Design a protein around this ligand. Structure first.
Ligand SMILES: *[C@@H]1O[C@H](CO)[C@@H](O[C@@H]2O[C@H](CO)[C@@H](O[C@@H]3O[C@H](CO)[C@@H](O)[C@H](O)[C@@H]3O)[C@H](O)[C@H]2NC(C)=O)[C@H](O)[C@H]1NC(C)=O
Lengths: 211, 220, 212, 194, 218
């Protein structure tokens, strides 16, 4: 039962420093090849660096001199120290167990790294009130930075909901909407509430929807 | 049988790009590391860097790291030393040397490549006679010569009597004047009895500018 | 570096058919190629290694072939949820490189969109910004056209669109078109309409609301 | 009494890099010119010794290490290098003195369909010390569960086989490598040139 | 980096005598695995590329005559020429290839120590051709002297000149082992005609008193 869980991702200014962590279970970290692979948002996968079972480290030319891969077997964790970060480094970084520096047979869930001189701003939630057999309603999550934002309905189960991908606005702030299709004959019988959580700003806002 | 042959003399203006080459030939060439040595006018030898042509293993001296790029092309057995923007301080003779390993003495040397970096333009020499006199007779051994002034670039060739007169000839090294031009004097030693009977002519040739001067020098 | 080109860029197949993905390399890699599957919101999952062999837990339907420069990923008996983004990775020569990917989608029956429009909330208007949202829900195929008409005047330059991935069960799509304008500009107009052109719609469908 | 350099260079078959051969050479006359005056080599890289200046020098022992690697991996046969071959198969000391010699051997070590006889160690807990040879075939334990000498999950065979095919690119082609190592102890010198 | 220093800067030994050149290293260039110091000696004749004489601090290159011999170990090395021939006149460099970067010594100039020879001094008034161009040049020649060290001073109507004279010296002649010097005084034609006496003053080891060659304009 192999688990790779990552953390440390977030927002950092250009030229700053960040360090991702990757806890590993089900195999010995020091006895295996370990690699970091990043997928830039909307682009392809790119190999970043590798550490050998013997301890040798190699890096991609784009990230050479800036990134540093390491491991701490006492915590079964693989690290990637990112220094002198740039806007192009913005990507979802993955942690992958490497089979002899050839291919990746196990992957971590991934962590998002955002590099911008912008500043964290909390989201604002507005009701998409249903009006006029079935009905549709939702909440509008607008003007936040950076991503991601998680939305849930009626405090952790409803189904039949669609949370659209966030879209970057001309102001430089993301925005998204979550919708849910509900029976029309149950407007006031059930009080519908949307849970919005924007971790990078610790903003946890719940808004009711009603006509 | 390894030997090194370098590219020809280069005259450039500051800020221009230059790329001199070093072609080697012979058996056992695959094991010879090619290094470059700089020798500024009148001063000693400076080691610039080295490269192994087989895999372009390049190692620079810290003084020259980032100032020059050393490369090679193993297809044609040729190594290169290149500048992006030349400075006047780069005016020096450049040698390429070969050795059969790293941390091995340089066995094979090239003939050298003179490089001149100046803001000056090609100008023809002016030749003036140094006439013999009672101030240059010293009994039975008179002295005369020619003054080759204000030319660029080097070199000038000075001959006496179309190369026939060679004994007693002293062609002095050129000196770089503050005007950016070169000046030179060549003098000869002849018996003082032959001033009137024989005619002495100095032949000055400046190939970089077509200048060819035959100056007759006679007592005034 | 070695550049890997995947062909086609995308393809739309039906459950039970066969899909043939290809990977082409700038140089020879001698079967040192691997394939991965990345469902949305999840990490890549190893499918084959060495260009032929399945990994642990990979169903028999997946198959690999080819060698040298040209490779083929042949998934058969396409399950409804067999559709994700598939990458080819070479490890013959450093640096190891991936392809740009090949998307894979399910073709289901054509479904007309359910169009709903939402006026900006009074709470949002107090902030000084008005947002009008048009919702296209449970429609196939993905291709759809949304136009914003304000007082019968086509509105351009202040609308953004967002499409969800294919549904987990219905395999349908959903699109949101949001019209953003200042509160001052919002009350300079009366009728806000959203017109949608789609395969399942014989004629365009318009949903509109007055201000009040 | 000439030195047997021909045996290691002219050998019909070479060893896998993980089991590299070492030929002890002593009490013989060393005509080094047969080596450097050749033209079949694509790489003849010497460190700290001049191959033309050894005829006048005497040594106690000279070692000739021979094996086959890929073209991409020849760069790893050098002091201060890292990689699969330098870390796990054949390591040179940082103060290495001698010459590493390589040449393309596609015509000899590649068979149609693949030779699959030359091997290299893929897994190891720690890097090899310089001039160390590891021939272990024990199942590599990548996890906490003992493998009991059987292959499976978290249990890999430490050795991997080269895919030497004539179609492959130049860097993938087999290359025979001979490394000359010079030893000078306080024992009487036995390896002298003409 | 390893630094190498030589001594003396210039050496003068007679024909057939011994020439000794010292080379001192900042750190040891000895290497235990070979027990050979990674020291080399080079010779550079004027206008010629350097040639490798001795490598590993004691072994001669093929074609080097026996009279060249290298010695020393660690940080001290010496190059010895047994019977100095006239063809050995050059500048000799010591160089270390123990560690990158390679470094050379500052160089040692070797000349033939001949007997003291006073210079022959001649002066040349500018030619009327050069005057017509607006510039006057007065040339003073020190011919066939030894040693190389000499002093030349220009005096125009007993006024010392500064910043208007350039100097050039020949290499040691291959037969008589002498040196020749030329000092050129350059003035504009206007300034040249403002003065009468142009004197060239010479100082040398072979002259009991400073010799002066002078001419009066016209
Ligand atoms: C490994 O086998 C090769 C054969 O490919 C041997 O190389 C050969 O060595 C002999 C030495 O007697 C060479 O013969 C002579 O070579 C010189 C140099 O060209 C030439 O002047 C003579 O006429 C004569 O041919 C032969 O050419 C050379 N062949 C090649 C292709 O280099 C080699 O001796 C064997 N290895 C060792 C370590 O001995």
């Amino acid at each position: 039962q192999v688990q790779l869980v990552e953390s440390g991702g977030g927002l950092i200014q250009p030229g700053g420093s960040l360090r991702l962590s990757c806890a590993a279970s089900g195999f010995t970290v020091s006895s295996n090849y370990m690699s970091w692979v990043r997928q830039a948002p909307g682009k392809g996968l790119e190999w970043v660096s590798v550490i050998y079972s013997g301890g040798s480290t190699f890096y991609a030319d784009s990230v050479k001199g800036r990134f540093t891969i390491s491991r701490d077997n006492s915590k079964s964790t693989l690290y990637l120290q990112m220094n002198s970060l740039r806007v192009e480094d913005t990507a979802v970084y993955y942690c992958a167990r490497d089979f002899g520096d050839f291919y990746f047979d196990y992957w971590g869930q991934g962590t998002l790294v955002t590099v911008s001189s912008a500043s964290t701003k909390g989201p604002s939630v507005f009701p998409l009130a249903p009006s006029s057999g079935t009905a549709a309603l939702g909440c509008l999550v607008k003007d936040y930075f950076p991503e991601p934002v998680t939305v849930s309905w009626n405090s952790g189960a409803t189904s039949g909901v669609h949370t659209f991908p966030a879209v970057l606005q001309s102001s430089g702030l993301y925005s998204l909407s979550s919708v849910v299709t509900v029976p029309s004959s149950s407007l006031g019988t059930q009080t519908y509430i949307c849970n919005v959580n924007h971790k990078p700003s610790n903003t946890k806002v719940d808004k009711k929807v009603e006509p | 049988e390894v030997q090194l042959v370098q590219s020809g003399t280069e005259v450039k203006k500051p800020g221009e790009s230059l790329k001199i080459s070093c072609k080697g030939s012979g058996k056992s060439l695959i094991m010879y590391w090619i290094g470059w040595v700089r020798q500024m006018p009148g001063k000693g030898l400076e080691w610039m860097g080295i490269i192994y042509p087989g895999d372009s293993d390049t190692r620079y001296s810290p003084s020259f790291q980032g100032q020059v790029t050393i490369s090679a092309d193993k297809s044609i057995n040729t190594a290169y030393l290149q500048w992006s923007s030349l400075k006047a301080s780069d005016t020096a003779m450049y040698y390429c040397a070969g050795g059969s390993g790293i941390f091995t003495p340089m066995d094979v040397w090239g003939q050298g490549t003179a490089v001149a970096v100046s803001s000056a333009s090609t100008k023809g020499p002016s030749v003036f006679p140094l006439a013999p006199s009672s101030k240059s007779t010293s009994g039975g051994t008179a002295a005369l010569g020619c003054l080759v002034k204000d030319y660029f670039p080097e070199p000038v060739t000075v001959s006496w009597n179309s190369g026939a007169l060679t004994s007693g000839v002293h062609t002095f090294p050129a000196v770089l004047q503050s005007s950016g031009l070169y000046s030179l004097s060549s003098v000869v030693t002849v018996p003082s009895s032959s001033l009137g009977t024989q005619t002495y002519i100095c032949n000055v040739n400046h190939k970089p500018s077509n200048t060819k001067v035959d100056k007759k020098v006679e007592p005034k | 570096e070695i550049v890997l080109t995947q062909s086609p860029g995308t393809l739309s197949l039906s459950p039970g058919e066969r899909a043939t993905l290809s990977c082409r390399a700038s140089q020879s890699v001698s079967s040192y190629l691997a394939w991965y599957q990345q469902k949305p919101g999840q990490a890549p999952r190893l499918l084959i290694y060495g260009a032929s062999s399945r990994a642990t837990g990979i169903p028999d339907r997946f198959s690999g072939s080819g060698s040298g420069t040209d490779f083929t990923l042949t998934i058969s008996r396409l399950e409804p949820e067999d559709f994700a983004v598939y990458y080819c990775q070479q490890y013959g020569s450093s640096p190891r490189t991936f392809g740009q990917g090949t998307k894979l989608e399910i073709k289901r029956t054509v479904a007309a969109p359910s169009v709903f429009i939402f006026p900006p909330s009074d709470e949002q208007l107090k902030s000084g910004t008005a947002s009008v949202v048009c919702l296209l829900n449970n429609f196939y195929p993905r291709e759809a056209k949304v136009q914003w008409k304000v007082d019968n005047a086509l509105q351009s330059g202040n609308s953004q669109e967002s499409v969800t991935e294919q549904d987990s069960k219905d395999s349908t799509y959903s699109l949101s078109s949001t019209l953003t304008l200042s509160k001052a500009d919002y009350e300079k107009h009366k009728v806000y309409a959203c017109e949608v052109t789609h395969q399942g719609l014989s004629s365009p469908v318009t949903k509109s609301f007055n201000r009040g | 009494n000439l030195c047997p350099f021909g045996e290691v260079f002219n050998a019909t078959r070479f060893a896998s890099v993980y089991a590299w051969n070492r030929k002890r050479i002593s009490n013989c006359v060393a005509d080094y010119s047969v080596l450097y005056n050749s033209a079949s080599f694509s790489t003849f890289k010497c460190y700290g010794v001049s191959p033309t200046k050894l005829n006048d020098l005497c040594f106690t022992n000279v070692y000739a290490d021979s094996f086959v690697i890929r073209g991409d991996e020849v760069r790893q046969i050098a002091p201060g290098q890292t990689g699969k071959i330098a870390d796990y198969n054949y390591k040179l000391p940082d103060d290495f003195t001698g010459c590493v010699i390589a040449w393309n051997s596609n015509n000899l070590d590649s068979k149609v369909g693949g030779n699959y006889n030359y091997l290299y160690r893929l897994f190891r807990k720690s890097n090899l010390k310089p001039f160390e040879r590891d021939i272990s075939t024990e199942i590599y334990q990548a996890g906490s569960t003992p493998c009991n000498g059987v292959e499976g999950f978290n249990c890999y065979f430490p050795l991997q086989s080269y895919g030497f095919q004539p179609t492959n690119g130049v860097g993938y082609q087999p290359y025979r490598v001979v490394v000359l190592s010079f030893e000078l102890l306080h024992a009487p010198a036995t390896v002298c040139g003409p």
